[PDB]
Write an enzyme that holds these catalytic residues in place. Structure first.
Site, mmCIF file in Angstrom:
data_model
loop_
_atom_site.group_PDB
_atom_site.id
_atom_site.type_symbol
_atom_site.label_atom_id
_atom_site.label_comp_id
_atom_site.label_asym_id
_atom_site.label_seq_id
_atom_site.Cartn_x
_atom_site.Cartn_y
_atom_site.Cartn_z
ATOM 1 N N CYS A 8 26.673 -36.393 -24.478
ATOM 2 C CA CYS A 8 26.057 -35.035 -23.950
ATOM 3 C C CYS A 8 26.451 -33.929 -24.826
ATOM 4 O O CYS A 8 26.870 -34.203 -26.002
ATOM 5 C CB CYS A 8 26.354 -34.747 -22.301
ATOM 6 S SG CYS A 8 28.123 -34.722 -22.183
ATOM 7 N N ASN A 11 30.655 -33.404 -23.555
ATOM 8 C CA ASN A 11 31.391 -34.456 -23.358
ATOM 9 C C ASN A 11 32.759 -34.149 -22.352
ATOM 10 O O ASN A 11 33.601 -34.756 -22.438
ATOM 11 C CB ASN A 11 31.915 -35.200 -24.619
ATOM 12 C CG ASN A 11 32.614 -36.307 -24.469
ATOM 13 O OD1 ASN A 11 33.623 -36.558 -25.246
ATOM 14 N ND2 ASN A 11 32.124 -37.249 -23.712
ATOM 15 N N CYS A 13 31.185 -33.130 -19.011
ATOM 16 C CA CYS A 13 30.608 -32.862 -17.786
ATOM 17 C C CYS A 13 29.861 -34.472 -17.597
ATOM 18 O O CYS A 13 30.330 -35.113 -16.671
ATOM 19 C CB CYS A 13 29.845 -31.771 -17.501
ATOM 20 S SG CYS A 13 30.434 -30.207 -17.343
ATOM 21 N N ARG A 14 28.695 -34.439 -18.134
ATOM 22 C CA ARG A 14 28.047 -35.668 -17.962
ATOM 23 C C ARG A 14 28.210 -36.724 -18.453
ATOM 24 O O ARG A 14 28.544 -38.004 -17.952
ATOM 25 C CB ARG A 14 26.436 -35.172 -18.393
ATOM 26 C CG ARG A 14 26.030 -33.943 -17.409
ATOM 27 C CD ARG A 14 24.606 -33.467 -18.136
ATOM 28 N NE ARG A 14 24.919 -32.808 -19.374
ATOM 29 C CZ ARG A 14 23.981 -32.302 -20.160
ATOM 30 N NH1 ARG A 14 22.669 -32.824 -19.947
ATOM 31 N NH2 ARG A 14 24.243 -31.613 -21.296
ATOM 32 N N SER A 15 28.569 -37.005 -19.842
ATOM 33 C CA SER A 15 28.624 -38.644 -20.313
ATOM 34 C C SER A 15 30.179 -39.037 -19.954
ATOM 35 O O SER A 15 30.237 -40.504 -20.070
ATOM 36 C CB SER A 15 28.518 -38.218 -21.847
ATOM 37 O OG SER A 15 29.368 -37.213 -22.521
ATOM 38 N N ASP A 123 22.898 -30.294 -17.101
ATOM 39 C CA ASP A 123 24.197 -29.837 -17.518
ATOM 40 C C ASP A 123 24.709 -29.080 -16.245
ATOM 41 O O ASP A 123 23.913 -28.211 -15.786
ATOM 42 C CB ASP A 123 24.111 -29.055 -18.769
ATOM 43 C CG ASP A 123 25.197 -28.235 -19.203
ATOM 44 O OD1 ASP A 123 26.269 -28.310 -18.469
ATOM 45 O OD2 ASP A 123 25.380 -27.577 -20.352
#
Length: 154
Positions: A8, A11, A13-15, A123
């Site tokens: 993301c 790196n 929050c999401r991935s 995000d």
């Protein structure tokens, strides 16, 4: 070994969620020949840990996150079989970074399992609370399973 890399923008929050969910998903399916990693397009948070709201969201679901932020590198496109973006901006960045003809397959994680309207993993960083992390988690749970079943388990 098959190697999967979740990407993301930062790196934090999401991935890291997608990485942890994918490992948990492989474990429940007893799939052991698949390695999972994650990394960042941008360098702001390199050396840090995931966002506290990402860590707490995984805890809520009995998962742990001990990942350290690193930035994507060009050799990633030769090491990993699958590289996943979270949103369309991710996909543009990966396209420009990938050496032409490198072995990695560039995919967007939400193209697996989710309905069309739910395929973007947004995000969540600039929201106040952690609700956006929970919805990313829910999306990753569905997407990761579907990818694993279709592509990894055939």
């Amino acid at each position: 070994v098959r190697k999967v890399l979740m990407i993301c923008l930062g790196n934090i929050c999401r991935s890291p969620i997608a990485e942890v969910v994918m490992v948990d998903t492989l474990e429940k399916a007893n799939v052991k020949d698949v390695e999972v990693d994650s990394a960042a397009i941008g360098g702001w948070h390199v050396g840090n840990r995931a966002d506290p709201r990402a860590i707490s969201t995984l805890q809520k679901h009995g998962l742990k996150c001990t990942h350290i932020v690193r930035q994507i590198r060009k050799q990633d496109f030769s090491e990993f079989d699958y590289i996943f973006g979270m949103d369309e901006d991710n996909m543009s960045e990966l396209r420009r970074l990938a050496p032409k003809g490198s072995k990695a397959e560039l995919l967007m994680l939400g193209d697996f399992g989710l309905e069309k309207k739910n395929r973007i993993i947004e995000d969540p960083y600039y929201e106040r609370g952690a609700e956006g992390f929970e919805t990313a988690y829910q999306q990753c749970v569905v997407a990761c399973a579907a990818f694993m079943k279709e592509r990894l388990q055939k």
